[PDB]
Amino acid sequence: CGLLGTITGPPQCDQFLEFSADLIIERREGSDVCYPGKFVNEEALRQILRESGGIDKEAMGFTYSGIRTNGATSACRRSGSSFYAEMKWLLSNTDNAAFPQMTKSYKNTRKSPALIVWGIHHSVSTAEQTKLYGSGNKLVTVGSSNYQQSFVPSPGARPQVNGLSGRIDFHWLMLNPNDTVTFSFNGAFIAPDRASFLRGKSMGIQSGVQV
Amino acid sequence: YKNTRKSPALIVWGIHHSVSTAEQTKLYGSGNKLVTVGSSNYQQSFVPSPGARPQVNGLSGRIDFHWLMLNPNDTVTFSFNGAFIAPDRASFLRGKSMGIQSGVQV
Amino acid sequence: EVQLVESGGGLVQPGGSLRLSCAASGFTFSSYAMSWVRQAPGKGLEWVSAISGSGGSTYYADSVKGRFTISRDNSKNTLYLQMNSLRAEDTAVYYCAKDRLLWFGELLFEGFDYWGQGTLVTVSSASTKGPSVFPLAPSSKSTSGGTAALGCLVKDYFPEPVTVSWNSGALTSGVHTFPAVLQSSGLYSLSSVVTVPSSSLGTQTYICNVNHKPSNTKVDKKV
Amino acid sequence: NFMLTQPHSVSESPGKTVTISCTRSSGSIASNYVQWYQQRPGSSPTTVIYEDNQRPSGVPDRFSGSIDSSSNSASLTISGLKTEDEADYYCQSYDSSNVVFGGGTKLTVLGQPKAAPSVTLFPPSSEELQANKATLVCLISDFYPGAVTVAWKADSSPVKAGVETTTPSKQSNNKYAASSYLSLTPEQWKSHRSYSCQVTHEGSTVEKTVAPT
Ligand SMILES: *[C@@H]1O[C@H](CO)[C@@H](O)[C@H](O)[C@H]1NC(C)=O
Ligand SMILES: *[C@@H]1O[C@H](CO)[C@@H](O)[C@H](O)[C@H]1NC(C)=O
């Protein structure tokens, strides 16, 4: 399990979604991803998690209406095709090739800052992008009181990793208590299902020796 | 491109920022241009920024360069539809040295 | 050059098994999912099953699920399809088709890019049978511009061929013997008709001569 | 799942331009990729289109792909027909784990003027009615192009069980012939009012009817 894979929950990290520790050990074989991609500002988020003491997961409770939320692949494989356990690959309807302009928001009711993570999908080609999330220019915005940033997918061919030439870009912000995060998106979104809270203090290391 | 050598490779490319959207489509055609670079430890994407600029050497265009470092046996893959200054040769480092900045004689 | 080759096609009594094997070459076989497509003799294409590059995931069609088992050996660059509890419906030509992706069954299928040459699997309890000839009588003295339509009906015969002549080879002009139909029972059947003048109806004798050599059954029939 | 629907017969003159359409029953046509395979008789199929418009290396530029989301159709298009383009054309698409194949389309390059088929429909012989069997023979001769559709009707109603229809084969005179034999039992034969053999060719229907005695 990769230390960042605890946030997204790829199949390797199914047993580490809500761990709690004083000492966290990363191993050289840990991969944070199943569907190829990488975290923006990865090390800062790793440094945050190493001294986090653990992760508590609270459902964010997004409901989606009249789109496809079963996105899956045989790269993230648990039973058959699957995906990241904490997230959802939002596709378009089989009936209509449209992705409606959606607005989804979350309020952090808790006393600790919330680790919100999400992905932006870079399809292999515009053909692939239009087939999954519908035609037209795709746009994803993220906003809070502190944080604001907007994202547009960059379709194109990437080197094969686990059979896929596409890439998912994972982004994250930290909601302060009582603040609100809002997602506008009409496609190319990997929405969070659950948020993440830090359990305490700990120390992370990197090693390859017996415990 | 695949790194067949026993040492990290240095890959450099450029993006062309044309003086206008007309200049830009003259060279590469109409459309929106996007370059995507990707490897194991690296993935990034770049968009040409055409528009009015002041002259530098009587030229209002710009070419900025980007670079990663390919680890051995790692494969780099480009996806471009224009505004791509493509690399012909990769660079390999030879060993250890030391660099200085000076304005006196050797 | 990518090339696929299938072997193992034969004739099988219904209720039997057959292990088809497709041979791959000219590409990295381990990194491309493979699939089996069949075509009934005179019907469209029908996808049968598929298998991932690793070999762990295996996907079957409904019509064959549980009876067919697909497998592969990445070292021998060979594909396999185990066909069990065979039926008359499963009689077709089977191709192995290289899939364009590593994984099969995920949100998007780019088709196939190369097709093996094919192999014929035939399933029928082929008992050799002599035909049973029936006369096709002409219309009630109704005609068009003098013509008329009468013939002989060859029914439930196996195997091909038969030979149908009229009046021991005398009547040649105006005859038409149709190709046989391979009906559901695994047997053939055909007819042959003559365009004759409507005058001689009732005043002349037309005899059809059917000759089936494998059954040693030869019958002359009158209309 | 869903089903795809192409015409059975398409014909045109050399150098002209055809389109073979493919219509999807359920689900949008632009929700997954569509292929176009071609099968010249006696050879394995080969793929002339993938991802709804893309030509493999070695496919003449006269082949084009298309997607019409309004009609929910995908349409092949061949410019400047050659004589070697004469084949059967299958469209293909995809669902959850299901691979859907079109019915197939027979593309004929006209080498001779079109000729409507000649239908001759026979009742069952009284001798077979003594074998407690009954067989209807619909003989179809001298048509071009070599594509027909045979439909049987029991007195006003489609009957598909017991029918056996031949693949059209060329006669001596470069025209095609076929047969269609409906199997019945004498109790069903004397049951209804009439029996019909409907042969469809190039959008025209020639119906013939027979009856007991
Ligand atoms: C957040 O709001 C709740 C009530 O909505 C209040 O009880 C709490 O004090 C607030 N916390 C902060 C840090 O403002
Ligand atoms: C690089 O790849 C070659 C070819 O597969 C292999 O022989 C070699 O051991 C590899 N070396 C490294 C350092 O990856």
Side-chain angles (χ1 to χ4, degrees), chain A residues 93-95 97 125 127-128 131, chain D residues 24 27-28 30-33 51-52:
Chain A
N93 264 137
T94 311
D95 169 58
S125 59
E128 205 193 69
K131 287 295 145 66
Chain D
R24 175 179 180 170
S28 185
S31 72
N32 199 293
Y33 288 149
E51 299 183 28
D52 319 332

Side-chain angles (χ1 to χ4, degrees), chain A residues 107-111 177-178:
Chain A
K107 194 196 173 199
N108 175 18
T109 77
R110 292 181 58 160
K111 291 180 184 179
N178 286 2

Side-chain angles (χ1 to χ4, degrees), chain A residues 123-135 155, chain C residues 108, chain D residues 30 32-33 51-54:
Chain A
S123 210
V124 183
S125 59
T126 56
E128 205 193 69
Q129 173 153 312
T130 51
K131 287 295 145 66
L132 286 176
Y133 316 94
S135 53
Chain C
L108 220 33
Chain D
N32 199 293
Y33 288 149
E51 299 183 28
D52 319 332
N53 61 8
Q54 295 281 328

Side-chain angles (χ1 to χ4, degrees), chain A residues 31-110:
Chain A
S31 180
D32 313 348
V33 304
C34 50
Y35 191 87
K38 76 173 302 172
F39 272 77
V40 173
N41 302 10
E42 34 188 335
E43 205 70 26
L45 179 62
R46 287 203 183 102
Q47 296 178 0
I48 284 186
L49 297 181
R50 295 205 200 101
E51 63 171 0
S52 55
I55 306 173
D56 182 22
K57 296 278 192 27
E58 179 191 274
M60 308 186 62
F62 287 172
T63 67
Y64 312 98
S65 303
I67 68 180
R68 193 139 98 259
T69 168
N70 31 312
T73 177
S74 324
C76 316
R77 164 176 168 97
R78 295 189 169 86
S79 147
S81 315
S82 191
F83 200 78
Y84 294 92
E86 315 273 37
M87 311 226 298
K88 296 192 165 308
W89 190 359
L90 304 192
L91 292 324
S92 267
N93 264 137
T94 311
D95 169 58
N96 201 10
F99 199 101
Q101 173 80 28
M102 278 181 153
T103 304
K104 289 302 159 190
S105 190
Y106 177 90
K107 194 196 173 199
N108 175 18
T109 77
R110 292 181 58 160

Side-chain angles (χ1 to χ4, degrees), chain D residues 5-23:
Chain D
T5 314
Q6 317 152 194
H8 183 17
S9 60
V10 175
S11 65
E12 242 306 338
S13 319
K16 296 286 190 167
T17 293
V18 304
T19 82
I20 306 182
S21 79
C22 173
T23 309

Side-chain angles (χ1 to χ4, degrees), chain A residues 4-14 17 34 78 83-86:
Chain A
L4 302 185
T6 62
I7 303 302
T8 61
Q12 321 102 283
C13 297
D14 277 336
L17 293 169
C34 50
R78 295 189 169 86
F83 200 78
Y84 294 92
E86 315 273 37

Side-chain angles (χ1 to χ4, degrees), chain D:
Chain D
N1 42 9
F2 59 85
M3 76 200 304
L4 293 160
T5 314
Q6 317 152 194
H8 183 17
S9 60
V10 175
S11 65
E12 242 306 338
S13 319
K16 296 286 190 167
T17 293
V18 304
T19 82
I20 306 182
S21 79
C22 173
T23 309
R24 175 179 180 170
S25 43
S26 152
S28 185
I29 189 53
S31 72
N32 199 293
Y33 288 149
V34 182
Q35 278 56 255
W36 293 95
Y37 306 97
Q38 121 154 312
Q39 174 172 27
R40 276 172 291 194
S43 294
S44 61
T46 59
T47 88
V48 315
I49 292 288
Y50 61 80
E51 299 183 28
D52 319 332
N53 61 8
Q54 295 281 328
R55 291 182 303 278
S57 293
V59 165
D61 51 342
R62 32 185 170 93
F63 294 80
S64 88
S66 51
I67 299 282
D68 177 29
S69 45
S70 173
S71 56
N72 215 84
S73 92
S75 305
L76 188 61
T77 297
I78 307 186
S79 312
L81 289 130
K82 302 259 211 304
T83 52
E84 76 244 32
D85 298 348
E86 174 170 306
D88 307 66
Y89 288 83
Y90 296 91
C91 66
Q92 182 266 310
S93 186
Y94 180 75
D95 202 9
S96 60
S97 286
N98 185 237
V99 190
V100 182
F101 270 120
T105 289
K106 190 87 169 61
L107 183 63
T108 295
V109 279
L110 299 183
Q112 56 200 84
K114 307 182 182 187
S118 207
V119 176
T120 303
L121 180 45
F122 291 83
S125 56
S126 299
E127 298 78 320
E128 186 179 359
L129 297 165
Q130 305 320 290
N132 201 16
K133 312 197 175 192
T135 302
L136 266 61
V137 185
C138 188
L139 305 162
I140 327 173
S141 77
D142 291 321
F143 64 87
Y144 182 95
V148 295
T149 283
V150 179
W152 293 79
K153 301 207 182 292
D155 156 43
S156 199
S157 314
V159 46
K160 197 188 164 188
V163 317
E164 303 279 0
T165 320
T166 39
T167 37
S169 40
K170 182 170 295 186
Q171 286 184 154
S172 62
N173 54 328
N174 288 326
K175 304 252 281 293
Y176 288 90
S179 309
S180 176
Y181 308 73
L182 168 59
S183 300
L184 293 182
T185 205
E187 313 281 53
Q188 294 300 320
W189 163 240
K190 315 191 187 70
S191 172
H192 302 259
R193 287 225 64 262
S194 62
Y195 259 75
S196 311
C197 170
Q198 287 202 345
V199 177
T200 291
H201 192 269
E202 296 278 331
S204 285
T205 326
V206 48
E207 308 158 60
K208 293 302 173 187
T209 305
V210 289
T213 314

